[PDB]
């Protein structure tokens, strides 16, 4: 069973899903206009059966309330602050973190705020300085939606299909439609303005293991660019690509994605640590 509960935080009321796994904790952070519900394959599958998988909803997303203060909360660094507060409330200082897309950018911002993080895996996330956005992301019509406040019904469907990929389910529309659109506009503006830490430098200098796993056919991430990003400690020494998967390989190719995730968790939590 999945343990659903809600936390009162300084950002608002944050919905949290937890698997019943007794093993080391894994925080999974969803993407723009998604929710932790998207991680059903991990929560309910072999990953969540072994490890304590924690999948919250960002403020303005899913079953969480809108942010008490959108100006504070709706930014990569503001979300990192919220997730850090969530983990402190849960009493967990040393989670492995998996971040999907926006969630990966949030994970990068969490490195400074959550120093006992045992590793970070990013999927759908090119670490980029603000001036590198065109290099890290592919141009297209669904990309413009990332920072667009108001979604038409058609926008909801287009965004859901491109970002979540195969298979499409009606329930995805409900998640995307709920999202506080102010969060899209503000986060995107602040990202381009460099209001938080330079993500290129952060990942270059970070000493914890960082794993990079992407679908080969995602419409958003420039994989070549990602394969050239400098990481302080790149897990298994390369960026990884899953064939026949798009932006969301954790749902499009769960077995192959879970192989990477499980191995990364094992590596970050069950090997003898030496500096
Ligand atoms: Ni979706």
From TrEMBL:
InterPro entries in alphabetical order: AB_hydrolase_1, AB_hydrolase_fold, AB_hydrolase_sf, Epox_hydrolase-like
Gene Ontology terms, MF aspect: hydrolase activity, acting on ester bonds
GO cellular component: membrane
SUPFAM superfamilies: alpha/beta-Hydrolases
Domain AB hydrolase-1: 25-252
Alphabetic keyword roster: Hydrolase
Coiled coil regions, renumbered to chain: none
Name of the protein in its database record: Alpha/beta hydrolase fold protein
Organism of provenance: Ochrobactrum sp. T63
Taxonomic lineage of the native organism: Bacteria, Pseudomonadati, Pseudomonadota, Alphaproteobacteria, Hyphomicrobiales
Gene label: aidH
């Amino acid at each position: 069973t999945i343990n659903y509960h809600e936390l009162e935080t300084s950002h608002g009321r944050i919905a949290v899903r937890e698997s019943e796994g007794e093993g080391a904790p894994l925080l999974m952070i969803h993407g723009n206009s998604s929710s932790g519900a998207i991680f059903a394959p991990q929560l309910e599958g072999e990953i969540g059966k072994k490890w304590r998988v924690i999948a919250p909803d960002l403020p303005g997303h899913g079953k969480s309330t809108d942010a008490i203060d959108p100006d504070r909360s709706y930014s990569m660094e503001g979300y990192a602050d919220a997730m850090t507060e969530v983990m402190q409330q849960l009493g967990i200082a040393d989670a492995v973190v998996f971040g999907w897309s926006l969630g990966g950018h949030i994970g990068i911002e969490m490195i400074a705020r959550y120093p006992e993080m045992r590793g970070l895996m990013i999927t759908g996330t090119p670490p980029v300085a603000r001036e590198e956005v065109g290099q890290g992301f592919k141009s297209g019509p669904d990309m413009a939606l990332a920072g667009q406040e108001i979604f038409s019904e058609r926008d909801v469907e287009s965004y859901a299909r491109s970002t979540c990929g195969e298979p499409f389910e009606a329930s995805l529309l409900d998640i995307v439609a709920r999202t506080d659109g102010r969060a899209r506009r503000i986060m995107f503006e602040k990202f381009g303005s460099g209001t938080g830490g330079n993500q290129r430098d952060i990942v270059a200098e970070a000493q914890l293991p960082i794993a990079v796993v992407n679908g080969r056919d995602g419409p958003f991430v420039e994989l070549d660019f990602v394969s050239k990003v400098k990481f302080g400690n790149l897990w298994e020494g390369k960026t990884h690509v899953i064939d026949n998967a798009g932006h969301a390989p954790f749902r499009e190719a769960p077995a192959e994605f879970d192989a990477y995730l499980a191995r990364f968790i094992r590596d970050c939590t069950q090997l003898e640590h030496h500096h």
